[PDB]
Amino acid sequence: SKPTLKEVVIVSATRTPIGSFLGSLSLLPATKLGSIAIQGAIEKAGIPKEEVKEAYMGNVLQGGEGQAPTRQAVLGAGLPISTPCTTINKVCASGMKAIMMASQSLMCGHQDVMVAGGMESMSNVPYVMNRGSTPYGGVKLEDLIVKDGLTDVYNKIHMGSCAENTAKKLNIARNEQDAYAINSYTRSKAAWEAGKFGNEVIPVTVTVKGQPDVVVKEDEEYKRVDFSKVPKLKTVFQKENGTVTAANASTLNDGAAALVLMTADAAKRLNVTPLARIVAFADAAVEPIDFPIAPVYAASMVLKDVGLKKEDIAMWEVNEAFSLVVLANIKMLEIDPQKVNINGGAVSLGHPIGMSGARIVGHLTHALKQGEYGLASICNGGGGASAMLIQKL
Amino acid sequence: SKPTLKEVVIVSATRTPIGSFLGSLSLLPATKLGSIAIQGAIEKAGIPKEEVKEAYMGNVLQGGEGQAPTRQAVLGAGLPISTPCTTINKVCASGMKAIMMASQSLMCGHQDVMVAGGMESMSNVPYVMNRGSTPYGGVKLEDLIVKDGLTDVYNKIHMGSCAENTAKKLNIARNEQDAYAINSYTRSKAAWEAGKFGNEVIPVTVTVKGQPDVVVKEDEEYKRVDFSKVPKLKTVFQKENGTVTAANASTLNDGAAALVLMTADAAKRLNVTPLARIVAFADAAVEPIDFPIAPVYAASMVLKDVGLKKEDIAMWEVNEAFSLVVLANIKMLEIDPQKVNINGGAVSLGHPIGMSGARIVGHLTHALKQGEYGLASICNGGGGASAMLIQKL
Amino acid sequence: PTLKEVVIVSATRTPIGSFLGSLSLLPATKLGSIAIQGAIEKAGIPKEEVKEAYMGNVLQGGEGQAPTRQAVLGAGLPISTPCTTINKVCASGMKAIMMASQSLMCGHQDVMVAGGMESMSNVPYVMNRGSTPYGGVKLEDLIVKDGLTDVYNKIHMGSCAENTAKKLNIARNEQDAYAINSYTRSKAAWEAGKFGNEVIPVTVTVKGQPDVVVKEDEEYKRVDFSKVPKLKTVFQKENGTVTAANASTLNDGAAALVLMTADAAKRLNVTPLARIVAFADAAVEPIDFPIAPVYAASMVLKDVGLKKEDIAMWEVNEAFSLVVLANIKMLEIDPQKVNINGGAVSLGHPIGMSGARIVGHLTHALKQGEYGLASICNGGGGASAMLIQKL
Amino acid sequence: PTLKEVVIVSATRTPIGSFLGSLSLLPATKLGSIAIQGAIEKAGIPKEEVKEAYMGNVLQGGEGQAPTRQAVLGAGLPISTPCTTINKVCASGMKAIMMASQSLMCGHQDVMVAGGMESMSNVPYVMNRGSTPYGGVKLEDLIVKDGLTDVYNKIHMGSCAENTAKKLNIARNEQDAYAINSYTRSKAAWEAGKFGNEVIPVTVTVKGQPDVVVKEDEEYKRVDFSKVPKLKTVFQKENGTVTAANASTLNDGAAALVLMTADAAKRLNVTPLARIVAFADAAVEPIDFPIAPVYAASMVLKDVGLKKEDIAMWEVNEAFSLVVLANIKMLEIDPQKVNINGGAVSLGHPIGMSGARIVGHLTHALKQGEYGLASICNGGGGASAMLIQKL
């Protein structure tokens, strides 16, 4: 009737700090950030590097990164030349989809240990020029962040304008979004001060010929705020009756996250103690413009599949693509906002698009208390979302 | 214990013709070719579009294609907005890896029907300019085909130069390579004129305003050859004792392929006759320069895994990245040349890189006789290969 | 010293090539070399006699260092020859001749070459120095940016023409009739062999290809009279007058004159073609450049006490059909004496070359004793004019 | 008519800014307007008296149509003022003065402005028109392609300087000593207030930021004498001599002079600063440009019948320290009379401007009755020189 599958466990979840656009980590390619997160995750797992059998990494903006970004990140982390690698693109959901797909390989018994995560260096995303002849009168070379990353293909508008569309329908006003945003910055600061990212974040040292070293040991974005200015900001994506601003939207960022995943049997063989069990996951899709609400349906799928209720979830991570998205999800699901993005999120910590889906699973892994269920969901351009249920061990 | 998995069958396999670089299909983006193949596959399968639950497309050079290439391809094929999509990058192995990952989802019982394949428009791959301050003395605009597609990161040389290195190691000379190349063109012409791609390839109508419609109904590349010229050509990747020429290497091309995959149970439910069973698959990786021999190890893994012998394979599809690669594989596996790439391959038909791993699997599906085993393998930049074993139903 | 008299000893040019057309493979400086060599040959003097060279050239971006020096050295003139490149927009080729004449008048040199050169086919695009702006980078076309856009008004030259069409009531049908007349006159002149002494052929050499000899202007054949009244108004969509047919085109070409003092011409026993009588620049409100040649022409006439009736042949550069009509309207001159063998609307307009071409054409076409007046407008509101008398 | 006497009535310049430095937000034409307006104000004449303007400007790409016209109209001069932009590479700013003097000598104008302008900070990159080559392309830097690369040898100006250093045995240490000397002289002259009638300040305004007043040259402070002997030889790896310290730098600036006939100065009740006595251009093999100024200077001296000893001060443009040393050696002049208040190695070298700056500096620094001689080399193998006498 129903397939009998291997049990999948998370043994470590590690990330770089998230750097701001053109900021602290901007000199480092996405693949280098990948290598740093992958090397960190293997160290934290306490396993040999040779034990990693295969690697999948989310990475949305691959233009100009060179051949096989995941291979670059893996070989860059000192893993064996024998390690197969695949780079995954589900827009903002990439980092999560990588984990899901790796989980599926493990469930099939096709590998026993894998690394999965995401990486993005938005600072280093290039501009493009069409192949062919230059038209008389000039041409604008397009920005790949905008063209590939942030523009809905079908509506020919920015992700922000799609968010405005949801704001309208669900009556989610500027003040509520601004309040959510301030709250995210508040929670991010609290968490960092309380040392809530001790085992999760590893520092990166930026070495430049001549000048002194810079050690980046925390997320850069959450300190770039002025609470007084927040309600004074102009709406960036919609002038007429807008709600979304630079403050209450996610930002553009650099970072990478990696998880060591293995079967239950593998963890025993290697004598390592798992952090959490990956229970179920799902993808959902809606009209491209309606992506902010796709996480609702994805989350519900996962709950229905396992036969749990929203109340059974101790901790939710709903990616803060826009403050609007989180509020849209809180509204439709009817869940306790005190249980949502408790230690901050993409609005204040930043959103390296290919890594965020991995980061939020990594964070549940650490923050959950033994036995608790954690649910992470993440929307994506095109009308998609991914969700994942884990249980702490 | 080994998991108990669902059985996966191929119900249809369809592709566009392969267009030459800046040739017959150069006006169509990769995603549009994707839509044509996906629509083709579904119609050929004789199922409602709504039965397709999820889609994975291989696509190596995603820059400038717009957000979520697979979503574009899927929605462009008129599939429901409810259909989740993911774009896969394992370089030249992408089209096969997409099928593999879709198979793992089916095996897990996570979906019952999926579309998997590959797409590439090398004609439309753009040039790139780095973000940042313009360096004194000049700004480089790099060709993404060269930078992301064809250049080994680690050795900093063309794929063709890596091939030369294997030609050296295994003493595969210019004459043998040229002979293989002529053989490939010969087989392609024969197969095309015999009507052998009658159920595999669907024609493409190119429409230009004011111009007469062009119907591309067959592969463009195989007619672009002069056998007398073959031995005369210069070895374009190496000065001292070269072997690889434009004639005996694959070309740059445009095309897409798509397969409808389902569980044995779903095929029964939908009352469709499955074409083949997907038995096993594997990824192998070696030293980046040695990618030409990676398919040897991947095929060997698959054979060892299923407990089959090389002699048990009725038809081999070893992707013709370079004539060199096929010869190296024949050499190491000690297989019958007459059973390899029987109706031509990438040297004569062209190599839209994200598509080819899907095409060759689709070709075995149509070409195998009832009960026969077919093995498809494909190398990728970085030092990898994927391989798949199917059995005709 | 007293001021020296200046004579034109030779005047030569390449054919004019269409945009991305027959001469598009040759850089402007190479066209310049061809013209300069040809003029020296026609003058019948040793190259060593040429003391200094000035060339008009408007769009110098990407041509490499010192375009006039490249033209001169490329024509095999002595390394001792000083060179200067001149930019008065479309007036450049005439202003080079004027400034050369002044040097000769001062006794500072006795023999010079002056002319102009342009390869609009090879003018590049530009990217600004600095940081790439988020959201995209603009690559501007230097033809449009440096060549054809008025700085002050932020409009195309073609829109300045429309402005004059309004103020002087010069209609679309009138501009179209002028353009058709220009194409007619160019074809008639070419058929009659009127350019046999003025134009020298250019051989275009490509590796692995057979040589192509370009012996005549390309542009004047690119016309369909039936289509002329049907064309869209490209610079002003609504109630416009200027079109692709009735405007000058973008083109490649070079022209060069050998100039000497009367004393040097005698010393070298060459037969001068014409004497330079007077020249002048005028400038007006930037948008009103179409009428600047009227003032420039008036200045030269007044300078030497001649009346408009004393001019046998007028060359009023055909930047637009509108410009010539405006000049005829304001000066009230006989249209049958204006641009008699065609002009820039039909022959094309390599912008730095045209002001030299039209002086050179008068030098060949005028009959002994006749006066010719050449005038040419330029972006920014300028014009230059020159009066010569055929010897 | 006989040749008219030419006088310099004012000479003014912006400070020179470093590459991407204090004046980098201003286009060349705006620096031009500032210098022109300053020169006219200092002259004390109605601006309407200025009849025509020539400005040197080497790297014109992307500056928009008719750079000199933009500078002149931006300075508030009348729309009736004709304008021409001059390109003789680094000699441009001097050649503009020479050409304007020739017009005045002919009596073709009685008052002109002449000078030079350059914003190397704003010089763009270029992409060729046409289809993009498979495998990509490098967009060239116009400073490098048009400004600093010799066409014929396909090497940097700096490598041409190396050739002369080798031929004349002018060593690394001698070049460094000259460069330190220039920096020392520049600082001392700035500290003594020697530029108070020459340089006018520039206020740089950014909406949202406070005003920055640029009141002195930026470059001469960017030096560390202890480092000078440690620098790499950036144009030549083996046996090199030229470095960043002992070569001129890339810079932004403009200079403008008001020139009149002696009659016009009398008419307008103006007391001129200096008389323009003579000028000349010389040219040699392109690679040998460093020595062209020797020949240009010798021409002027021989023309007027002066000997080197009759010259009170020499301004030999400091394109490289090597150039000045080659000139001092070949001419056998007293080094204490050469570039007395610094030069391009330490003040910087906005290439279209420097030839005018050095003439303006002599006009201010010479004492009554003294002769000053300015000379300047240019890419392609040229030089210009000019002799003035202080009144």
Ligand SMILES: CC(C)(COP(=O)(O)OP(=O)(O)OC[C@H]1O[C@@H](n2cnc3c(N)ncnc32)[C@H](O)[C@@H]1OP(=O)(O)O)[C@@H](O)C(=O)NCCC(=O)NCCS
């Ligand atoms: C919104 C976006 C375009 C940034 O806008 P921006 O205008 O270039 O951002 P800026 O840094 O110029 O900020 C604009 C203003 O907001 C202010 N601001 C920004 N963040 C702030 C904060 N946290 N608190 C207070 N003020 C803030 C700035 O000070 C600035 O004020 P100013 O106009 O007086 O100078 C970009 O971050 C974006 O597109 N984000 C969404 C990313 C996305 O869509 N991801 C995928 C999800 S589907």
Ligand SMILES: CC(C)(COP(=O)(O)OP(=O)(O)OC[C@H]1O[C@@H](n2cnc3c(N)ncnc32)[C@H](O)[C@@H]1OP(=O)(O)O)[C@@H](O)C(=O)NCCC(=O)NCCS
């Ligand atoms: C080989 C490659 C660099 C193109 O080289 P190219 O020299 O620009 O190819 P061209 O079309 O200019 O062909 C060169 C010559 O070969 C000839 N030629 C090419 N294919 C031929 C054939 N099949 N039969 C006869 N002659 C042929 C052409 O006529 C041409 O001759 P010419 O010099 O008289 O014009 C490019 O196609 C490539 O990189 N291929 C490999 C792709 C790859 O690496 N894929 C991934 C695998 S890991």
Ligand SMILES: CC(C)(COP(=O)(O)OP(=O)(O)OC[C@H]1O[C@@H](n2cnc3c(N)ncnc32)[C@H](O)[C@@H]1OP(=O)(O)O)[C@@H](O)C(=O)NCCC(=O)NCCS
């Ligand atoms: C006018 C200009 C913008 C060209 O415009 P364009 O629309 O790209 O010109 P095209 O070549 O595409 O011609 C457009 C149409 O006119 C037609 N056409 C052009 N010249 C024609 C002629 N002489 N007779 C008949 N038809 C003609 C073309 O066939 C084309 O027809 P189509 O739309 O059915 O295909 C350009 O030549 C220009 O800027 N000229 C002015 C140059 C200038 O200002 N110089 C300085 C003077 S101050």
Ligand SMILES: CC(C)(COP(=O)(O)OP(=O)(O)OC[C@H]1O[C@@H](n2cnc3c(N)ncnc32)[C@H](O)[C@@H]1OP(=O)(O)O)[C@@H](O)C(=O)NCCC(=O)NCCS
């Ligand atoms: C020389 C040139 C290429 C600049 O070279 P650069 O290497 O990019 O110059 P930089 O500013 O990076 O200086 C390099 C080094 O020299 C040092 N330096 C430069 N000028 C110095 C000075 N005056 N004193 C001490 N040190 C100095 C810098 O500190 C730097 O040292 P670092 O490597 O420890 O940081 C450029 O200025 C040039 O082309 N000049 C010639 C212009 C020209 O040819 N004009 C026309 C004449 S015909």
Ligand SMILES: [Cl-]
């Ligand atoms: Cl999706």
Ligand SMILES: [Cl-]
């Ligand atoms: Cl791999």
Ligand SMILES: [Cl-]
């Ligand atoms: Cl010169």
Ligand SMILES: [Cl-]
């Ligand atoms: Cl003017």
Ligand SMILES: [K+]
């Ligand atoms: K924010």
Ligand SMILES: [K+]
């Ligand atoms: K081939």
Ligand SMILES: [K+]
């Ligand atoms: K025309």
Ligand SMILES: [K+]
């Ligand atoms: K210096």
